[PDB]
């Protein structure tokens, strides 16, 4: 079948080819995919970034249909459509398995980089790891929510954020536009949204946003201030790759605030230990979200409580759109359309 | 009434003076000190580190009897030991006061900062906000406990830890030295020591720290993953100024751990964001406590679960306790006796 696998020479692109997937184990099952959005992370397992992952496929966005299981398997059925995630399996018994962090497994599976994702017409997965996609949510948002949806939302509910508090987003991309999203119609947070991209801010607004920032035209952590009463916000999720959002996040926190980093910028951060200690502000990393984190996020996709903005793409594209999401073009998520 | 005061031009001494208090309004109380820990904190407030303060009274680790009460005061009377601390009065109504968190107060008054402190024969206190020192704790122990114990006490909180778990602490001497017998002694960690210096090791090995690591002959980080099974500690207390012992603390968190900040890094910290989200780690700080922390930290001295190491000296000789804290040569906390008797 045909896949898009990381290059013999990792430089940031796929190569597409045809595969043949091994025969599935008893636990397992193979899905005919229909959709694979794709996200930063796959530039960064195509870039080297992780390692020498060469012939690997890519994508941890998948949504298929299971056309074979295995012996073993109760969960799912031949015809249900399911997921295939960063998280793509845990080791089930570790201290992070067994106490509701299965993310932080140090034996983790993880799709498209340490085993074949999505991004092919055919799929194995392990069957109690793929989360089946509920009824009345479209298949291509599905893909949005498969990492982008379940990242913030995850990454929202370790903010601490409860409603009625101020939260900024620095970054309105795939990522950034999808956490407003549940900011404002799930968790009932304000929302700032802060980006140099008018356009990304446009659409910001509509779906969400309560105030936008252009952090080119302004300084976003004085006019947080303004907006605020004086003091800052009480988290700051921060879905942009560049070193001075994270910073610009920090200082805009009023104190006891807390500061969120999802996106994965190969780059440091300075650290305002100051920020910290005076302020009670913290600092966390947020990784994906449990199994249990993903099925809570499609729940809000299927209700309307989220609509992930999407758009298709063939998989000869796959070159095309890496390009393009570097070059910041892109609103929401380009999806690889296997049907 | 003789006071410690931030100079006219301040250059970081204190002048000696003669001060008549204001008489004290109707929710307040008049004490006569007995003890006030010189702190770091007073060197940068009479450097002008933090701004122009002129003529404030010095001291923020102050412990006193009461001699007077305003005639609105039921919370203390004549003759209770009391102390005068960095969180000296919150404003009681605001998001902090009220959440539990009243030492973010933004109006918020600090001991020997914004409000005279409690290095002089004699303070005013706000009452209610004078925390009552138990009488199990030596008073010149609790000078201590206002300052460096409640923010190590109260930074062990934040970090999580709970019985079992393997704690880290940076810096051994100076505020890790009372760090390591709480997390030990107060909340059942298994802890691990990390300094330069190995004197300090061997006298944190013997108030409770189960691992000692000397960082001038080993990478404390490697070590640390060895002794806690390949993952790594789950919280990391830092006191240590050198900028390394933050970058070590972080790197040796197991996932999910948290890194708290309880001294300055003399040159600014980084991160790296991959490794923060892959291993969804957590940095935060903590200074002083509330009243009610404050109150807990008193209780485990008081039990003698934790000794801060103080000795005293005369009012007389506080610039010359200066002098001894630039060039670091204090270990523990030089407190001024007021005390006759
Ligand atoms: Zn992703
Ligand atoms: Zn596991
Ligand atoms: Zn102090
Ligand atoms: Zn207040």
Known sequence: MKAAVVRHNPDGYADLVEKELRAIKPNEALLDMEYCGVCHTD???AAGDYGNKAGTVLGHEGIGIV?????????????????????????????????GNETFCREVKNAGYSVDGGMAEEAIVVADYAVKVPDGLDPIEASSITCAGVTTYKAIKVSGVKPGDW????????????????????????????????DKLNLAKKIGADVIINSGDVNPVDEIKKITGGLGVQSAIVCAVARIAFEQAVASLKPMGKMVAVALPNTEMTLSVPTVVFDGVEVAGSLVGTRLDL???F??????????????????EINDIIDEMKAGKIEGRMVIDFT
């Open 43 to 45: 530039l960064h397992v």
């Open 67 to 99: 056309k074979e299981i295995g012996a073993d398997v109760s969960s799912l059925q031949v015809g249900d459509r399911v997921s295939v995630a960063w998280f793509f399996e845990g080791c089930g018994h570790c201290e992070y398995c067994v106490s």
């Open 167 to 198: 939260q900024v987003i620095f970054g309105a991309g795939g990522l950034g536009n999808l956490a407003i999203q549940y900011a404002k119609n799930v968790f009932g947070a304000k929302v700032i949204a802060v980006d140099i991209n008018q």
């Open 295 to 297: 099925a809570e996020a």
């Open 299 to 316: 729940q809000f996709g299927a209700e309307g409580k989220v609509k992930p903005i999407v758009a298709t793409r063939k998989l000869e």
